[PDB]
Symmetry: C3
Subunit: 424 residues, 3 copies
Amino acid sequence: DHDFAISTSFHGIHNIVQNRSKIRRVLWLVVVLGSVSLVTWQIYIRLLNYFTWPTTTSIEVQYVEKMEFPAVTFCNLNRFQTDAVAKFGVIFFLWHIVSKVLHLQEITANSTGSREATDFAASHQNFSIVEFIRNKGFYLNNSTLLDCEFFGKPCSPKDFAHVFTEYGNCFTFNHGVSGRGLSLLFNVNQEAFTDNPALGFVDAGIIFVIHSPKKVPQFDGLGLLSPVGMHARVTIRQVKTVHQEYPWGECNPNIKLQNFSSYSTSGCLKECKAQHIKKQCGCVPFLLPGYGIECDLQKYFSCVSPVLDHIEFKDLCTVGTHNSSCPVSCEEIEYPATISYSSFPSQKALKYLSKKLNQSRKYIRENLVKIEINYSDLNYKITQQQKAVSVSELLADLGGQLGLFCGASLITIIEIIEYLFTNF
Amino acid sequence: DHDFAISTSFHGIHNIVQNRSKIRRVLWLVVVLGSVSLVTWQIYIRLLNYFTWPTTTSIEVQYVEKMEFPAVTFCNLNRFQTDAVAKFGVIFFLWHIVSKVLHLQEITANSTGSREATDFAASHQNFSIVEFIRNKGFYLNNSTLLDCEFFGKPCSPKDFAHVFTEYGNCFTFNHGVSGRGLSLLFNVNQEAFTDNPALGFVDAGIIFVIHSPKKVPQFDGLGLLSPVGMHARVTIRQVKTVHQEYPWGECNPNIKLQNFSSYSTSGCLKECKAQHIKKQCGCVPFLLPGYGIECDLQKYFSCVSPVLDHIEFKDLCTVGTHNSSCPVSCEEIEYPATISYSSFPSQKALKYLSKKLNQSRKYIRENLVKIEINYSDLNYKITQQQKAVSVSELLADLGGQLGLFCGASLITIIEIIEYLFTNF
Amino acid sequence: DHDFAISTSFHGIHNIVQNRSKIRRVLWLVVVLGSVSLVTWQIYIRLLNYFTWPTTTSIEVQYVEKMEFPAVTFCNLNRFQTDAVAKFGVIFFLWHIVSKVLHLQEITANSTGSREATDFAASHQNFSIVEFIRNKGFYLNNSTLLDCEFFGKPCSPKDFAHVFTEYGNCFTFNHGVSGRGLSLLFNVNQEAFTDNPALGFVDAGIIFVIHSPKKVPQFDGLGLLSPVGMHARVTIRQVKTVHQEYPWGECNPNIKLQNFSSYSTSGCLKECKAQHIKKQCGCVPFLLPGYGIECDLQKYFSCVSPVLDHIEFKDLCTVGTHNSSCPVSCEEIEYPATISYSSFPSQKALKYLSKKLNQSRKYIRENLVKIEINYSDLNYKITQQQKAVSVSELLADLGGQLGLFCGASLITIIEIIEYLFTNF
């Protein structure tokens, strides 16, 4: 009988009855009660905290012998060749309507431009807008990209690749060491290219964005700028972040895009919009790369624009937490940039360039742009979200907290359970 | 007797005397001594570390369906209408003296401007500087704010609110989704507004600062800029930080401002200066919003400037740690910004704007400013300071460290104490 | 006999044989085996994790009553006085060759400039390039530094110190409170200074870099810029980072530079290059401060440039991890900066400055530069790499994990070992 109380190896209270004294027995019983009470309260609290799925983050800065230079893409803030637009003004509103897929900016209904564009779309059903923008848009050529070098190696227009964005033709670089970097000298040729000011496209200069090669450029007002007549120096540093899965973080690794190119939030949004629009129309706008047939011009007014309006009005596409349609990615790469400027044509260099290009000194100040992109002296930086706890970690805390007061362990718990099993 | 050594549940050494052997008894005594010696040393060390009140910080990045756009405020780098200042030059030095409350920049004594300003203040005692600056300062009007939109919705001058700063009249916006943001097109009208160059106000352009709506703008050289004739794109991302109380961090939540608008370091400085000045003079400079009566002009020279000089000399107002007069706030919101530029009037748009405003092409280049502020694609970032330890955490470590060597617990400590109590 | 099993204070299973029952004995043996099996597996795992030398990083933001303003250095983007270069064009290629030590940019062999420079070097062996660049380079003077102030105190050209960089003469400031800072107004005098455009030096403006006073400026494309005719405002905040030693982090504190000025990565690279070159030639290029004799001009072509080519081609000098020749420093200071601009000469101030300097209005727009550098409202930020574990920490985890299941301690391990020793 007494062996049950005397043999239970938990520190507990062996002398509850073996003390053979009233005061000692009462004290021992009180201790036995209180120790386990505190232990169970603490363990309940600890389990409650665990069920919150806590996390912690860490910051580290690595460096490598050599590193990948992120891809860059460029576009001209004047989107159309002047002659092709001189007698064809409706093109502005046509392109605006077609680009609503990306820029998501509402058009005043029954506006003169909208009315004329609708009339033209009703008339010239077989007209090909995409071919027009490809042929008559911006273009890279010895007459446009005067100079360009990369880590001391010359590069040629053939090295770039074509891309479509709301600004028309856009060109990427490096598509799929400190100090050194990419250097360029554009000739925006402001007299040859033009744009509608009434639509707000008033500024002149080069708009470019930095992105990882796997990505598709975004722009939509997030791209950087560079003015005419000033040499702009841009310094960048790679930044990488990691997120934990939804139970702890917000990523959902299991989702995959129809292109199957891993995953990317903007790609998820594009695919979602393509999927939605395909239901309401048998064709997909070509600005979304390869989801199906390109719609005839009239379909843009007939179905596309109302569909986008409805999508935004009902928030059928969203990003952010796992509850959103396109949750955050497991891994992401950002390239923060800082900028500084210098007057590009110096008086001494101005005449030299004028002789080189057989053009007036006014033209040089009013047309040329020089850009330089370099890695900073500190190469790399990473942010990582840690799993604050797993099953083992909680058990480690459980044992220490349990042993703190009661001076017990799982073996003692098993022994106590064995004693209970006989009584039950 | 022997039950005391045999029954003490602490692992220790039960066989100190029960071993019935010299070597075993000596070994057991040595073990019993050494285990507790190491345990007590470790526990003392750990208590010492705890009394340092350690802390750790974490970084996280959240996102929401929609977010609040921070308030923005603007001012003109030319502060006074040209005609009102043409025959009234003393106004420059008068305003400088009055603004010493904010800009805290010393004035060379007995300077011609200072002498003339003192003479005028002695003469025109009843002159109202504040009314003058309100009436003749900068102003928002269809002639000044040519265009402005907010998330695609047009906005009108009536949407702004008036504010006083060292630059005279200043206007706020949004006072108390990615890509989209605020767009503006100012007409600085450099011919109509003017400023004293001898005082250093040589540059022309728009100066603005970004702050949470609850806050009061600061400027004092911390505001951003935007030049004339260039379209400036500004991208921002909300950053939030939290600090622990003085025993761990530096915050002192218990301090409350007389306006009772929660707390803010700059507000604390303003209130402290108002309190100090009110003692030495029955009136408070109006640039401090609502602490009492506004002082007559002469009082600025009589008391205010010497009082400010004394304040700075004796450091009667300070910020930073809890020892400072205005300690750091518990919660803070900052909006870091990056900037890039483009030439604003394009050759094609230049003529259009000239026709629109019936003004020369030179005027357009020399007067207009265009600004755009957008949220970045990543919305939110927060920094939080964690309590590295509370009472429970130290106890958890205490039990594990104690159990490591001696294999004991609080229950054993109680049992050991009970044995000691009988002997005592 | 039975005392061995009954007396072993480890919770384990005292009743393996004392149970006097088959089922109880089997259960107790199973428990004794399983508890220690799990414990040993967990302890092995934990030792494995420890041997990874884990680390964690923390971020904190402190503030002080006053703080040290970092040193700044400036250079002119036009490097040579126009007259001295008018009839001496070979100087451009000569300086390019000599500066190859720093800019590490390859020269096209047998180029006309290279041929003529080699001819001159063969002819004028005793010509002193360093004296030439010192005398005829950029210079600070009342004719060049029109104005400059520091925290409200006027400063004079005598306060700067001379330095040599690839841009020729360069001047430092502050060499070995919020809002207030450094203000300057340069006169680049674009007519008096000039540079070769064919070498790419086309832009005009001021190039400057921010560094701690102990450091030597780097430039090499990492320096900031500021254009002509625009007032540039620069805001900075001090950032400090701390790294752990190679076993945990990447620092190797034991390495010391020959100058013994503590340590710095760029200093390590400079010293390494000097050491390598000194072997292949008895003289060291003067751009490396004080490592020995300066080489005669011909030696630059004879030995230096081939030696640099070989160094780069064999990566004999490297930075980064401890495996690299110049590992990361233990402590580093960076000064990230953000920039904004305003049109410098306002119409009202333009005439005033023209009268002040007796120069045409065109000159003022085409020659003057204004800069201002200020500390942000948040002073200081530090990043620290923590030792995730020491010997004591692992022992703390070891005891808790051991006590979790087996309910044992080192004392029990000693008792078990004592029992084993007798059997052995």
